[PDB]
């Protein structure tokens, strides 16, 4: 007997999900949240990263626009 006897062997023919591909197929299966409990931490780190980390950005933008405004270069 296999590991499970429910439908075919496991998890709705788990062989098709497992051994067809892991380089891209597994990552595509891990599309978003609510797959495992680690997705909350991953989303938290993603929204911390996507913070445009913001004093230098303001400084460079202000200096560039001021330089362009002051004179025709």
UniProtKB/Swiss-Prot annotation:
Source species, domain of life: Eukaryota
Localization, UniProt: Sarcoplasmic reticulum membrane
Tissue expression as described in the entry: Highly expressed in heart, lung, cerebellum and brain. Detected at lower levels in adrenal gland, stomach, thymus, esophagus and ovary.
Post-translational modification (record): Channel activity is modulated by phosphorylation. Phosphorylation is increased in failing heart, leading to calcium leaks and increased cytoplasmic Ca(2+) levels.
UniProt note: phenotype after gene disruption: Embryonically lethal. Embryos die at about 10 dpc, due to defects in heart tube development. Cardiac myotubes display enlarged rough endoplasmic reticulum and cytoplasmic vesicles that contain high levels of Ca(2+).
PTM annotation (Phosphoserine): residues: 44
Its biological purpose: Cytosolic calcium-activated calcium channel that mediates the release of Ca(2+) from the sarcoplasmic reticulum into the cytosol and thereby plays a key role in triggering cardiac muscle contraction. Aberrant channel activation can lead to cardiac arrhythmia. In cardiac myocytes, calcium release is triggered by increased Ca(2+) cytosolic levels due to activation of the L-type calcium channel CACNA1C. The calcium channel activity is modulated by formation of heterotetramers with RYR3. Required for cellular calcium ion homeostasis. Required for embryonic heart development.
Subunit (UniProt): Homotetramer. Can also form heterotetramers with RYR1 and RYR3. Interacts with CALM and S100A1; these interactions regulate channel activity. Identified in a complex composed of RYR2, FKBP1B, PKA catalytic subunit, PRKAR2A, AKAP6, and the protein phosphatases PP2A and PP1. Interacts directly with FKBP1B, PKA, PP1 and PP2A. Interacts with FKBP1A and FKBP1B; these interactions may stabilize the channel in its closed state and prevent Ca(2+) leaks. Interacts with SELENON. Identified in a complex, composed of FSD2, CMYA5 and RYR2.
Domain notes: The calcium release channel activity resides in the C-terminal region while the remaining part of the protein resides in the cytoplasm.
Family, as annotated: Belongs to the ryanodine receptor (TC 1.A.3.1) family. RYR2 subfamily.
Protein name: Ryanodine receptor 2
Organism: Mus musculus
Residues of the full protein shown: 1987 to 2074 of 4966
């Amino acid at each position: 007997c296999p590991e499970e006897i429910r439908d075919q062997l496991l998890d709705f023919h788990e062989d098709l999900m497992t051994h067809c591909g892991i380089e891209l197929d597994e990552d595509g299966s891990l599309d978003g949240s609510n797959d495992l409990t680690i997705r909350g931490r991953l989303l938290a780190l993603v929204e911390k990263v996507t913070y445009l980390k913001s004093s230098l950005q303001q400084l460079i933008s202000e200096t560039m626009v001021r330089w362009a405004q002051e004179s025709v270069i």
